[PDB]
Design a protein around this ligand. Structure first.
Ligand SMILES: Cc1ncc(COP(=O)(O)O)c(CNC(CCC(=O)O)C(=O)O)c1O
Ligand SMILES: Cc1ncc(COP(=O)(O)O)c(CNC(CCC(=O)O)C(=O)O)c1O
Ligand SMILES: [Mg+2]
Lengths: 390, 390
């Protein structure tokens, strides 16, 4: 089976977005400008954060997020610092840690939530832990309350990779706003899509400043006269426009993406709505499934897609399932990357350690799968899927 | 709101580019794909390189260019390794060196060509030198023949930042193809423009493959069955498609840029021809300027723009010239960034050293200025310029 009728991805666009590109074309201004800024403003508003910075991708968002910590007047991070992460996530969640010389401490996930295992996190955290980098998997937010209990008020930075859970909420607060900084992705087929695109949110003005700076050449052009980076900008452009203060990058997003994001954000409430209705329907259909477990929701998940974990001693073979789905026209993939720890070749480059074991991650790596969720009603696709997975 | 008699920049697009953008819309495939691939083939073919890798910007081309060196089966670079660079260039030429923990050795420029001072280089090179990162300034190529004499068999890697000199040639050879790798930029107002964009060229297959991997998640999806990173790609999709082997990034370009890029390459030759003809005229007008020195051409420059250095013992103050230019409706700027070494703040982060001195760079910093060159005839503009600069 190779004929796909129930795909993982689909378009979130309509006329409005095409018109938006048009507006850009007419403007003949393609470099990051007005729209990006407007986009950022609404973005922060939408999620309930003070600041938001748009970047080229969710991956680059992650990059700047980590980097930023090295540049505070009083650097918040230092080479060799210990950072805790879950064993399951996207590759670019981990790379920047390596690229910045951090010591990475891996923590197993919770088999029901798919998020970091709270119990293990409990023990994993020590006096050496400088930061915790959480990942809201597949739309499901982490239990921040519990996380917070662990920190117990210490000076441990909390960070969030919210690339898969835009719109998710916990305790009424938007996922991605819990940490010092939160990242998002607007890549094709995410809660929203801007072709390629990412964002970083924060309530910290210094960090905010740093970001603006590191996003583009390490210059002061995007900074305000009075800023937390250089204090006060010289009034001499010949000089001013040509000074570099931080070792940054060029990860500016395109104006087009910004203009598109604007249209997309307006639709967000509806997208979340549909996705959630679909999930409700799904949970109901798969409630007592004989050999598959579904993701256990925390707070209000933005249900990026649907995960399945073959029940222990169910004798079910992932391979057949997959075959079966495909033959039926259902597209499927591993749960993200599966157990990240399997990537031995890339790990060679990391300075890392594993807390305890990553048993659950290993199980998932072998018995997990996932099908798409859309901002479109999938009742019928769901009935069929249930039919197939008998 | 403009009111410019002589702009630094201009658009290089016509209906063709707009047409290309339309074509992509219609295709509904916005993520890097066919167009990008077509572009790369055309690109390599155009400059005489075996391979080309399109990236999100010239800046990221640079980044990947440095990074790739650490991933060869037999790593070409390691932390602490010494790399030589000229004192004048864009900030993104430098950051990656810092980001990879290399030991930076700044070398002064030649006040005439504006490129690295060949004589100092000779002196700067030691057995500790691992690589030389050259920069082709403002369209002017370096004298590779001499540099080559300098390397004299030794195992020193030659690199090129060709972001300002697309189209330049030396000894019948295209700038960017001299070093193991070469970087290019297609940002607004370059020789070609794709909104944002970069490219890396190479004749090395292993490097080529490394680049393919790190550009996009450090995965294998863009790698051939038989490739130099993993050797042979599994046939199992649910597995092979989710494997990470190198710590890269997500610096993919948009399918759109590649589409635009395709059209731009065709126009490239004329663009170059027009700029060179402008240069020819400019030179005749300024060749014997009483107080201004012009750029000394090496090989066949692609004349990115027109540089001027106030002659020593002239009694002419830069500040006053700028004022005049400006009141005259003539846009001017510093030569690139000027003396990079003046950037004390950002230097704090570097492991660097300065060979001898950067007197030339310091001179240029206080005495140089730059005016635009375009792919449109500027006869009248040049005349006016000469009039203002009486
Ligand atoms: C946990 C996590 N972090 C970061 C990212 C990435 O953001 P971005 O894609 O804009 O770099 C993703 C999404 N991962 C992917 C991989 C697919 C792809 O980018 O081709 C996604 O955005 O779909 C992710 O799931
Ligand atoms: C030597 C050199 N390296 C790298 C770059 C950068 O390529 P890119 O800009 O696509 O990241 C430039 C151009 N420098 C500038 C600064 C102006 C700007 O980016 O707004 C250019 O793109 O013209 C450069 O001159
Ligand atoms: Mg004319």
């Amino acid at each position: 089976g190779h004929m796909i009728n129930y795909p993982l991805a689909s378009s979130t666009w309509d006329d409005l977005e095409y018109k938006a590109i048009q507006s850009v074309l007419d403007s003949k201004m393609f470099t990051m400008g007005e729209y990006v800024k407007q986009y950022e403003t609404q973005f922060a508003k939408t999620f309930g954060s003070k600041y938001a910075v748009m970047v080229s991708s969710g991956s680059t968002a992650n990059l700047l997020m980590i980097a930023a910590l090295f540049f505070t007047k009083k650097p918040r991070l230092k080479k060799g610092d210990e950072i805790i992460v879950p064993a399951v996530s996207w590759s670019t969640t981990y790379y920047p840690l390596q690229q910045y010389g951090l010591r990475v401490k891996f923590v197993d996930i919770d088999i029901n939530t798919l998020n970091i295992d709270i119990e293990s996190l409990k023990e994993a955290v020590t006096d050496s832990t400088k930061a915790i980098l959480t990942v809201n998997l597949l739309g499901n937010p982490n239990n921040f309350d519990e996380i917070n209990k662990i920190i117990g008020g210490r000076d441990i930075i909390l960070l969030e990779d919210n690339c898969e859970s835009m719109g998710a909420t916990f305790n009424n607060k938007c996922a991605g706003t819990f940490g010092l900084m939160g990242t998002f992705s607007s890549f094709y087929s995410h809660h929203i899509a801007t072709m390629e695109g990412g964002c970083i949110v924060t309530d910290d003005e210094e960090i905010y400043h740093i970001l603006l700076c590191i996003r583009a050449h390490g210059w002061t052009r995007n900074l305000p006269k009075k800023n937390k980076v250089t204090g006060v900008k010289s009034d001499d452009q010949f000089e001013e426009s040509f000074k570099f203060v931080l070792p940054g990058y060029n990860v500016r997003p395109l104006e087009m993406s910004g203009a598109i994001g604007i249209e997309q954000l307006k639709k967000l409430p509806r997208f979340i709505s549909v996705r959630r209705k679909n999930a409700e329907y799904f949970l109901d259909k798969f409630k007592d499934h004989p050999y598959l477990d579904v993701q256990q929701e925390t707070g209000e998940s933005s249900w990026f897609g649907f995960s399945f974990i073959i029940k222990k001693d169910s004798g079910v073979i992932r391979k057949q399932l997959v075959e079966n789905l495909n033959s039926a026209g259902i597209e499927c993939r591993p749960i993200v990357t599966g157990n990240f720890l399997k990537n031995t070749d890339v790990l060679k480059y990391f300075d890392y350690t594993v807390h305890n074991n990553v048993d659950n991650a290993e199980y998932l790596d072998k018995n997990g799968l996932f099908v798409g969720n859309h901002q479109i009603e999938l009742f019928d696709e769901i009935d069929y899927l249930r039919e197939v997975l008998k």
